Design a protein around this ligand. Structure first.
Ligand SMILES: *[C@@H]1O[C@H](CO)[C@@H](O[C@@H]2O[C@H](CO)[C@@H](O[C@@H]3O[C@H](CO)[C@@H](O)[C@H](O)[C@@H]3O)[C@H](O)[C@H]2NC(C)=O)[C@H](O)[C@H]1NC(C)=O
Ligand SMILES: *[C@@H]1O[C@H](CO)[C@@H](O[C@@H]2O[C@H](CO)[C@@H](O[C@@H]3O[C@H](CO)[C@@H](O)[C@H](O)[C@@H]3O)[C@H](O)[C@H]2NC(C)=O)[C@H](O)[C@H]1NC(C)=O
Ligand SMILES: *[C@@H]1O[C@H](CO)[C@@H](O[C@@H]2O[C@H](CO)[C@@H](O[C@@H]3O[C@H](CO)[C@@H](O)[C@H](O)[C@@H]3O)[C@H](O)[C@H]2NC(C)=O)[C@H](O)[C@H]1NC(C)=O
Ligand SMILES: *[C@@H]1O[C@H](CO)[C@@H](O[C@@H]2O[C@H](CO)[C@@H](O)[C@H](O)[C@H]2NC(C)=O)[C@H](O)[C@H]1NC(C)=O
Ligand SMILES: CC(=O)N[C@@H]1[C@@H](O)[C@H](O)[C@@H](CO)O[C@H]1O
Ligand SMILES: *[C@@H]1O[C@H](CO)[C@@H](O)[C@H](O)[C@H]1NC(C)=O
Ligand SMILES: *[C@@H]1O[C@H](CO)[C@@H](O)[C@H](O)[C@H]1NC(C)=O
Ligand SMILES: [Ca+2]
Ligand SMILES: [Ca+2]
Ligand SMILES: [Ca+2]
Ligand SMILES: [Ca+2]
Lengths: 880, 673
């Protein structure tokens, strides 16, 4: 919501297909594309570098080989930051092989280094890969660039990876993949970096003529497919645009966008699809719910898009999306924000379209790339290409401010209360002190701008009523305004208020609210231009001033209120389950009537209050309209949510009970215990000494998903050749385990392998290998079962669980079972045939049980109860 | 029934409260010191209070069916529905439709001229004497036209240079015509033999990319009949190609980023614009096409049958016709055309403003008793058997007078449905009783609406200076309640809730207890922002199609449905477009349980009881083996391979499906002893 629509730069270089594709070069420059900038004999186009300093585009020098013809370069672009490089492309090279020519594609890598040319410039001689137009869409990655082919084989598609001067690789979908004929796999390409290895993605607009998107991984000596998702509709063109974006800033790509400009059901606005990046192949959904659009048919929404990053400073990256088909063919662009993890906000905050005194440009927003600070005014910039010209929109600084309000005279002493009519109005003098300070600053950093700003303040008392209960002295009106200078350091000024000796209503405290904004906006240089406020701008902040209620001609007015609350049925409370937290608070009034009685809680950051609004029905119970305001308090961690029983009285020794519910975040940062309190008092504040706070402390645990399966590489080997009692046909029980939780947590995987059986060993020298992982330490202990009559026991069931034969427990501890880690391992041992006769039957089967464990306290499994943490493997020894 | 009080100042502001809100006009209904808002309750409550029945002002929605003489329109009546629609209340008007016959037809043959369409050009080049013959029965003097097409001139769709362009024909080079894309060979004419002979003339051509660019041809056809000509009655087209179809976006390959305009610009019955012009978007036809009353008839290979099948779902009035690669059974296509092309009765409407919502009903002739849904899909009616659509138009607010239309897709019959914002109510005037309201106000159905400066249930009070002792009686809900629940200053018994110049904030009620801001949130928005629902005294009144405490379970729809159209596949209730997959089954639609072990054990006994016949053990089978299906096809997914009852390794995949222990197997015809 902070995209400049006034003081921006505009490059209108008329060079045919100019401003048809653009990218953020090294921060200092922006590169535009003009594929159709005719040069020589039906040959290339040309590129243009443009600087902010001077509003002009300088041509860029290029050694266009005679070989590359009608390649119309610039059509595809891509820039990296790692070291700053750029990639321009002619995806339409024409090489005459006599009977018929084809299309190969030719790219150029530039930068502050050597002007490389990489297909690489082995002019693709004639004869699969004739019309693949490689470089149609490119994107970098720590291990070399990556260009995309379309006409690979049956126009299946793919992408040619280039390493560091090492010979390049390539990824299609094999041939065993019968489908994927004519889908342009690689029409669009994007990276998907992660704490682990990188991940590529290709767009296939026409998989079965609808559109699918496929994601690839490059495991050591594998380079297989991670997952994929078909399109939603035929022709929708699901696969057009793709953008891996970072909801937060942890650096690990969280989710991925998709384009489908030509989609609909009733309105053909367009379609962009949000699709997080779940880990664990063979499962992946572009349906983490939503998908942004607009109410305007034939709009081509999703034509292009780029990560913009943190613009409004709320730690939640924001993205941009083009739609050159909006309005009457006019252009358009949209701005959305992240939320928490995999998600975005359907309701956009801004919609800068071509109606923004764009004198006359038809379709704009065709392409766009942003995230780089190029004008060198601090915050990021955006570049959006349009037919003929390309614009730059800067991000205006969003600071927001916190405020405090207080009335020096806490309440009113009843002095100028009921008053009298011999002699004067001695108009009592109340003081009201307000302060203003700005705190969330991380992006704009110290120094000019982040500090100085002017502001308009507009205080007004008892606004909603046509009976001003007072007036400021400075102006004498029931309200006043003054422009004053803010800073990151508070600014406190107290004002003079005049209460008329005589007044009707005293029960209802007098309100004082402020309307504040950002006036002027001149700050030193014009390197800030316009700052602004955020979305959640509670610019209307109000503070109340109570009165000393007449509790009689005497009796002194004793404020006596107690309080006590509990949690009905609350069992254990782990973070994940038990999201909403039901609190049943009771409260007393063993003293004078409390009128505007307020009830405030203290809690860890990991929760806040949400209105219950229940009706339907219950109980002997809450009936109660109450106003609650959350706010940060303590030095670091805790904070208070106050809740004043808005509109009615709490009289006599009457008690009352209401219900207040606190939502808790699944990632609730809080100690192994969480306490909370309840300050209770009357509207007349707390005139005296010992507070009546009520607190309690609870043990806290945390959700975890821990599962374990029995890998199908398991030895069920029975066969008739049983002449003698040999030893070594070692069996192999492989167990794989992994946690889909969301927290790294130590664990200890236990096992149970039969051996001794009445002195007669079952299988000997059994140990456990731990491949693909460090040499971990495992424990070993023998144990003897209940010793029941095993004769008849296994006669029931040929099984040989550990309850019959002396088993062997393996306690393989684990330092930190990081989430997503599929840490797996197997166990083997030469299996003796001797004990087989001991029981006098055939087709027996020995079983091993494997159960994973973890500290029952602090952690625990979520869904109720999943025994997925206890696999099993049953081998057979049928030998006749 | 239901009626929550919004700010009630008049009888109209009681109407703007909800459907189940009624108003009482009977004077002297207000007690010694009772609120005026008490006059606005539910009809039942009013009678229980004493309010007469004929005093209950209840503006209801109804329909005006101004039927025409005849020939005005044919089988879409009524022809003019002037509805008077009160917000929240639905107005219902029926729609009789009894199709009659076949009108003057007008066909057009869109054939793909490739080297794969050779024996198609031979077995079709001149079989048009049996077309008018197949046209003779139902319709009379129709029309017949032809239009060829291949693919864009420029690459990468087909080699642009060099003289293989002059001679694309592969190997035979039997003088095939130059590579083209759309050549309007024949105009709509009466003759039939002249039509046949003008066709055989031209020979095939050829291109590179496998799929065709037939879509571009589509628009250009029905774009400018100022040069092609078209009948003012019927217009049927027919797509024919043993190849794919390129849509918008693919043009970027040919260095063309100029989108489809919609109008054809030819100079010699032959395109020369498709090169400097991008492909028509997929959705650019169901509009433009259906606007000119034209409807293609898919007829291609069985290889391209289920790809045009998914295309039938989207665009209206379109059939699928699987045929041989010789185009011999091409005339039987139209015996299947009118079959379900004159069967699909459609009943949509012009894109209405967001301030309105329209639905329909359906009573097909053959058994179907449908209710509540858009369109009018009844694929069970043909010649002379009427049908029934119950159109229910509802509004959300007091709309402004406007007008829309409800057409039948593929028909020129426009039904001008007028719409009138019905929300005023109508008793009396200020000639009767200039006395009460002490002269400074008028009377309307009992109560008196005072001037700007006068207030009170009898215009007795003014907004500058009032208050009495026990006038504060009905001014506080109960004896232990603060006056006007604060945020309101009492005057003349009642309260005047204060005003806040804060977005959304608004107090209201007898004792100023309710606001439109303090309810349950959702996605950082009040009651779900202005879109989903709204706020009224704590509870959220979610818009239509939205339920929940705060519109939390936002949609009453079911995105939980897969293509199988069974909710959440195996297990999992469908709550708020989400599935609660039982066991470890995962999202979104509950199919893959990544953790399940993969039980092939206990399945061997039944695997050799179905494919092989090695004795249903425990008992018989088809009883102890409800994996009922054993397709004779290469199904896959859960590649299993265990042993049999005695030694041999029996291989078999195992494709589970939907609910519980339901499966689908193919036991390899093999063993290994
Ligand atoms: C990448 O994709 C291709 C196609 O989708 C995979 O299949 C390859 O396709 C061709 C089809 O003609 C196979 O036939 C080859 O013919 C040529 C010349 O006639 C001959 O020189 C080759 O030796 C071969 O017979 C080809 O076998 C096949 N390629 C491979 C490597 O098997 C292809 O497998 C995919 N490439 C990779 C590295 O995964
Ligand atoms: C803080 O907010 C107050 C109240 O919202 C601002 O005061 C003035 O408020 C009015 C609306 O109550 C603004 O709209 C005006 O509406 C009238 C029609 O009723 C229209 O004719 C005017 O052109 C105007 O738009 C008004 O703009 C606003 N201030 C004025 C007089 O321009 C107040 O501006 C805010 N306080 C400050 C200065 O920080
Ligand atoms: C229980 O009740 C008390 C009173 O409401 C809370 O203790 C502290 O109360 C003071 C006001 O008496 C809070 O305001 C402080 O005011 C000074 C200026 O006089 C200001 O400089 C401080 O910054 C502070 O805002 C104070 O926030 C509050 N606690 C502190 C020391 O931070 C108390 O919050 C209630 N108990 C709990 C923890 O629930
Ligand atoms: C590139 O080729 C194009 C045609 O493919 C040339 O455009 C015109 O083409 C027609 C038809 O062959 C010729 O008769 C004209 O002479 C061409 N026009 C002009 C102005 O020359 C085009 O000239 C070629 N471009 C270049 C510079 O080689
Ligand atoms: C909740 C409450 O205040 N109840 C009162 C009651 O105490 C009193 O006796 C009665 C008559 O004055 O009015 C009512
Ligand atoms: C004085 O009070 C009036 C009425 O409240 C207000 O309209 C006006 O703006 C005030 N004047 C000044 C100088 O503040
Ligand atoms: C519309 O048709 C239905 C079904 O026959 C009938 O019950 C209903 O009364 C009709 N409505 C009108 C407005 O005539
Ligand atoms: Ca991320
Ligand atoms: Ca941000
Ligand atoms: Ca910048
Ligand atoms: Ca053929």
């Amino acid at each position: 919501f902070n995209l400049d629509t006034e003081e921006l730069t505009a490059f209108r270089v008329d060079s045919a297909g100019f401003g048809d594709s653009v990218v953020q070069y090294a921060n200092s420059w922006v590169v535009v594309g003009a594929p159709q900038k005719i040069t020589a004999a039906n040959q290339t186009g040309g590129l243009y570098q443009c600087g902010y300093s001077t509003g002009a585009c300088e041509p860029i020098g290029l050694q266009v080989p005679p070989e590359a013809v009608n390649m119309s370069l610039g059509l595809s672009l891509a820039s990296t930051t790692s070291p700053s490089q750029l990639l321009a492309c002619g995806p339409t090279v024409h090489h005459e092989c006599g009977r018929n020519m084809y299309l190969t594609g030719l790219c150029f890598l530039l930068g502050p280094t050597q002007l490389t040319q990489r297909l690489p410039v082995s002019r693709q001689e004639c004869p699969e890969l004739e019309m693949a137009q490689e470089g149609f869409s490119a994107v970098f990655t720590p291990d070399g660039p990556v260009l995309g082919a379309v006409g690979s084989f049956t126009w299946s598609g793919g992408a040619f990876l280039y390493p560091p001067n090492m010979s390049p690789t390539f990824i299609n979908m094999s041939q065993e993949n019968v489908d994927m004929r004519d889908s342009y796999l690689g029409y669009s390409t994007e990276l998907a970096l992660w704490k682990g290895v990188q991940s590529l993605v290709l767009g296939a607009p026409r998989y079965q003529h609808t559109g699918k998107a496929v994601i690839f991984t490059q495991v050591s000596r594998q380079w297989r497919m991670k997952a994929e998702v078909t399109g939603t509709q035929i022709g929708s063109y699901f696969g057009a645009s793709l953008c891996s974006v970072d909801v937060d800033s942890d650096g690990s790509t969280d989710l991925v966008l998709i384009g489908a400009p030509h989609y609909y059901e009733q309105t053909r606005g367009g379609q962009v699809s949000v699709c997080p990046l779940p880990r664990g192949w063979r499962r992946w959904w572009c349906d983490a719910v939503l998908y942004g659009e607009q109410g305007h048919p034939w709009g081509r929404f999703g034509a292009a898009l780029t990560v913009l990053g943190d613009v409004n400073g709320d730690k939640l990256t924001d993205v941009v999306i083009g739609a050159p088909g909006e309005e009457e063919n006019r252009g358009a662009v949209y701005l959305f924000h992240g939320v928490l993890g995999p998600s975005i906000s359907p309701s956009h905050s801004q919609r800068i379209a071509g109606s923004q005194l764009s004198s006359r440009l038809q379709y704009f927003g065709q392409a766009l790339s942003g995230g780089q600070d190029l004008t060198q005014d601090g915050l990021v910039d955006l570049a959006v290409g349009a037919r003929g010209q390309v614009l730059l929109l800067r991000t205006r600084p969003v600071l927001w401010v916190g405020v405090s309000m207080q009335f020096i005279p806490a309440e009113i002493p009843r002095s100028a209360f009921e008053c009298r009519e011999q002699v004067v109005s001695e108009q009592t003098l109340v003081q009201s002190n307000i302060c203003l300070y700005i705190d969330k600053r991380s992006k704009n950093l110290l120094g000019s701008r982040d500090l100085q700003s002017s502001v308009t303040l507009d205080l007004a008392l008892d606004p909603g009523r046509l009976s001003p209960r007072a007036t400021f002295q400075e102006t004498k009106n029931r309200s006043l305004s003054r422009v004053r200078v803010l800073g990151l350091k508070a600014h406190c000024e107290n004002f003079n208020l005049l209460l008329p000796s005589c007044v009707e209503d005293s029960v209802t405290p007098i309100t004082l609210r402020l309307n504040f904004t950002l006036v002027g906006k001149p700050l030193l240089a014009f390197r800030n231009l316009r700052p602004m406020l955020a979305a959640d701008a509670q610019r209307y902040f109000t503070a109340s001033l109570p009165f000393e209620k007449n509790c009689g001609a005497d009796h002194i007015c004793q404020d006596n209120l107690g309080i006590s609350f509990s949690f009905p049925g609350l069992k254990s409370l782990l973070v994940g389950s038990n999201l909403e937290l039901n609190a049943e608070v009771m409260v007393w009034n063993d003293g004078e009537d409390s009128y505007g009685t307020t009830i405030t809680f203290s809690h860890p950051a990991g929760l806040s209050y949400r209105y219950v609004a229940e009706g339907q029905k219950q109980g002997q119970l809450r009936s109660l309209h109450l106003t609650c305001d959350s706010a940060p308090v303590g030095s670091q961690g805790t904070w208070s949510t106050s809740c004043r029983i808005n509109h009615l009285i709490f009289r006599g020794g009457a008690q009352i009970t209401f219900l207040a519910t606190f939502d808790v975040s699944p990632k609730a940062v809080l100690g192994d215990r969480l306490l909370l309190t309840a300050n209770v008092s009357s509207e007349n504040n707390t005139p005296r000494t010992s507070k009546t706070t009520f607190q309690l402390e609870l043990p806290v645990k945390y959700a975890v998903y821990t599962v374990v399966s029995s890998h199908e590489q398991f030895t069920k080997y029975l066969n008739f050749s049983e002449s003698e009692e040999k030893e070594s046909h070692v069996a192999m029980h492989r167990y794989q385990v992994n946690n889909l939780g969301q927290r790294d947590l130590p664990v200890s995987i236990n096992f149970w392998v039969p051996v001794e059986l009445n002195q007669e060993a079952v299988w000997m020298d059994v140990e456990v290998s731990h491949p693909q992982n460090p040499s971990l330490r495992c424990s070993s202990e023998k144990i003897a079962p209940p010793a029941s009559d095993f004769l008849a026991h296994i006669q029931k069931n040929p099984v040989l669980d550990c309850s019959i034969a002396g088993c062997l427990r393996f306690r393989c501890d684990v330092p930190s079972f990081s989430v997503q880690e599929e840490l797996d391992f197997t166990l083997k041992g030469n299996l003796s045939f001797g004990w087989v006769r001991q029981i006098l039957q055939k087709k027996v089967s020995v079983v091993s049980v494997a159960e994973i464990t973890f500290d029952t306290s602090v952690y625990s499994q979520l869904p109720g109860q999943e025994a997925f943490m206890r696999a099993q493997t049953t081998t057979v020894l049928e030998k006749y | 029934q239901e009626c929550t009080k919004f700010k009630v100042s008049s009888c109209r502001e009681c109407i703007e409260s909800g459907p189940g809100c009624t108003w009482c006009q009977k004077l002297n209904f207000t007690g010694p010191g009772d609120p005026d808002s008490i006059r606005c309750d539910t009809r039942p409550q009013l009678l229980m209070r004493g309010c007469a029945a004929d005093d209950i002002m209840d503006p209801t929605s109804l329909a005006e069916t101004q039927e025409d003489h005849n020939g005005g329109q044919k089988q879409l009546s009524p022809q003019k529905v002037t509805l008077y629609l009160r917000p929240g209340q639905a107005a219902a008007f029926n729609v009789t439709f009894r199709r009659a016959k076949g009108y003057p037809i007008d066909l057009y043959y869109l054939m793909d001229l490739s080297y794969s369409m050779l024996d198609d050009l031979r077995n079709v080049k001149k079989l048009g004497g049996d077309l008018l013959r197949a046209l003779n029965e139902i319709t009379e003097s129709g029309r017949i036209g032809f239009g060829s097409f291949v693919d864009k001139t420029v690459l990468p769709f087909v080699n642009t240079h060099p003289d293989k362009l002059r001679n694309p024909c592969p190997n035979k080079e039997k003088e095939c015509q130059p590579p083209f894309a759309f050549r309007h060979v024949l105009k709509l004419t009466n003759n039939s033999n002249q039509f046949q002979t003008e066709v055989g003339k031209q020979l095939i051509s050829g291109n590179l990319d496998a799929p065709e660019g037939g879509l571009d041809a589509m628009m250009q056809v029905a774009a400018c009949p100022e040069e092609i000509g078209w009948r003012n009655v019927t217009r049927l087209l027919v797509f024919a190609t043993d190849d794919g179809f390129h849509f918008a976006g693919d043009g970027k390959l040919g260095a063309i980023l100029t989108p489809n305009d919609g109008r054809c610009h030819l100079e010699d019955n032959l395109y020369k614009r498709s090169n400097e012009f991008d492909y028509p978007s997929v959705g650019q036809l169901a509009h433009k096409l259906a606007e000119n009353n034209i409807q293609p008839i898919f007829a291609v290979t069985s290889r391209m049958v289920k790809t045009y099948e998914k295309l039938t779902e989207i665009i209206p009035k379109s059939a699928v016709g699987e045929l041989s690669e010789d185009s011999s059974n091409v005339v039987q296509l139209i015996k299947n055309a009118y079959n379900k092309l004159s069967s699909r009765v459609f009943l949509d409407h012009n894109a209405l403003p967001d301030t309105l919502k329209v639905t329909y009903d359906s009573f097909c002739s053959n058994g179907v008793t449908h209710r509540n849904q858009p369109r009018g899909d009844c694929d069970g009616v043909q010649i002379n058997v009427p049908i029934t659509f119950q159109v229910k138009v509802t509004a959300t607010e007091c709309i402004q007078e406007q007008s829309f239309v409800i057409r039948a897709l593929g028909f020129t019959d426009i039904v001008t449905v007028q719409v009138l914002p019905q929300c005023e109510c109508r008793c009396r005037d200020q000639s009767r009783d200039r006395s009460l309201c002490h002269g400074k106000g008028f009377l309307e159905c009992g109560i008196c609406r005072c001037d700007t400066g006068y207030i009170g249930k009898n215009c007795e009070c003014q907004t500058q200076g009032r208050s009495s002792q026990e006038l504060e009686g009905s001014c506080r809900k109960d004896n232990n309640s603060i006056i006007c629940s604060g945020l309101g200053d009492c005057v003349c018994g009642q309260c005047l809730c204060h005003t806040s110049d804060v977005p959304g904030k608004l107090i209201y009620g007898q004792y100023c207890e309710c606001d439109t801001i303090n309810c349950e949130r959702y996605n950082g928005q009040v009651c779900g922002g202005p879109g989903r629902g709204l706020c009224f005294c704590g509870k959220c009144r979610c818009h239509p199609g939205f339920e929940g405490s705060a519109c939390q379970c936002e949609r009453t729809t079911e995105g939980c449905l897969n293509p199988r159209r069974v909710e959440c596949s195996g297990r999992g209730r469908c709550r708020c477009n989400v599935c609660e997959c039982h066991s470890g089954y995962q999202l979104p639609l509950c199919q893959e349980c990544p953790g399940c072990p993969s039980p092939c054990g206990k399945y061997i006994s039944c695997a050799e009881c179905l494919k092989f016949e090695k004795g249903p053990f425990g008992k018989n089978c088809s009883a102890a083996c409800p994996g009922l299906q054993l397709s004779n096809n290469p199904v896959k997914g859960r590649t299993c391979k265990e042993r049999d009852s005695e030694g041999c390794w029996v291989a078999y995949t195992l494709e589970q499906q939907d609910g519980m222990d339901r499966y689908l197997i193919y036991v390899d015809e093999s063993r290994e002893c």
